[PDB]
């Protein structure tokens, strides 16, 4: 296959292109666009993203205005998620007044191109294969699941309790771990940078429905 030279202006072209990548390994795809494949993503957390973006044309930049977020999902040998999925940085400061409706999380997850990719540690990066892509939007239930988790997490941040957030917070979405934040007393604190992540139950559910369409 050949990478798109200009950003796609229709979801049809974006999806068709994504589909051309299925079956190929990351090494094969990286080589086809003159890119070297790192030994692991420890150094470049967003390497796979840079690569898929090149392929998907990411002439019509913001003009294309597709509003589609690309998200790769490392999966096991059975197509199941291996880890939580990073959504976006969690704002520890500012952004006061934000609500679920006006949140960057809801905005980022409005339209997503999910690309499953093998991710089991035993498989060298260059040998991991790309699976079948998904073009998704949360249904009413998924949006509710995210809203409730988002509201609980953000309220803690706004109340200066970011350091109190743990894996116990959030049924489908969590905030995972120096940057400035709001302290429990309103004092300014320095803490680990945080981010919003989708849990494996949420991403597994949407990946599963992809094989049950009728």
**CA–CA gap between residue 86 and residue 134 (Å, rounded):** 17
CB 149 within 8 A of CB 170: yes
Write the CATH number for 172: 3.40.600.10
Technique used: X-ray
Q: What gap in Å lies between CA 64 and CA 140, rounded to an integer?
A: 27
User: How far, in Å, CA of 122 to CA of 79, rounded?
Assistant: 15
Segment (H or E) for 31: helix 26-32
Q: Which residue in this structure is represented by tokens 């990719």?
A: 117
Please report the resolution in angstroms. Answer: 1.7
Reading the block at residue 212, the tokens are 């049950």
Q: Facing residues of 118 across strands?
A: 75
Close Cβ partners of 43 (under 8 Å, ≥ 6 residues apart): none
Q: Single out the residue of 194, 187, 174 nearest to residue 91, CA to CA.
A: 194
8: left (phi over 0), alpha (psi -120 to 50) or beta: beta
Q: How many independent structural domains does the chain possess? A: 1
Do 162 and 186 touch, CB atoms closer than 8 A? no
CB-based contacts of 84: which residues, under 8 Å, 6+ apart?
174, 176, 197, 198, 199, 200
Domain range enclosing 188: 1-214
């Amino acid at each position: 296959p050949r990478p798109l030279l200009s950003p796609p202006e229709t979801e049809e072209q974006l999806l068709a292109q994504a589909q051309q990548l299925s079956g190929y390994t990351l090494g094969e795809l990286a080589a086809l666009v003159g890119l070297v494949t790192p030994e692991n993503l420890k150094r470049d957390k967003g390497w796979i993203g840079v690569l898929l973006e090149i392929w998907l044309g990411a002439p019509e930049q913001d003009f294309a205005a597709l509003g589609v977020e690309l998200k790769t999902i490392p999966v096991d040998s059975l197509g199941r998620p291996l880890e939580t999925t990073f959504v976006c940085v969690a704002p520890l400061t500012g952004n006061s007044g934000v609500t679920w409706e006006t949140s960057h999380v809801r905005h980022k997850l409005k339209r997503v191109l999910w690309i499953p990719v093998e991710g089991e540690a035993s498989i060298p990066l260059a040998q991991r294969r790309v699976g079948s892509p998904l073009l998704w939007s949360p249904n009413e239930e998924e949006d509710r699941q995210l809203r409730e988790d988002w509201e609980e997490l953000m309220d803690m941040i706004v109340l200066g309790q970011v350091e109190r957030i743990t894996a116990r917070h959030g049924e489908y979405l969590q905030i995972r771990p120096l940057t400035e934040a709001i302290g429990a007393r309103g004092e300014r604190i320095l803490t680990l940078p945080r981010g919003f992540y989708l849990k494996k139950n949420f991403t597994s559910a949407l990946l599963a429905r992809h094989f049950l369409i009728q």
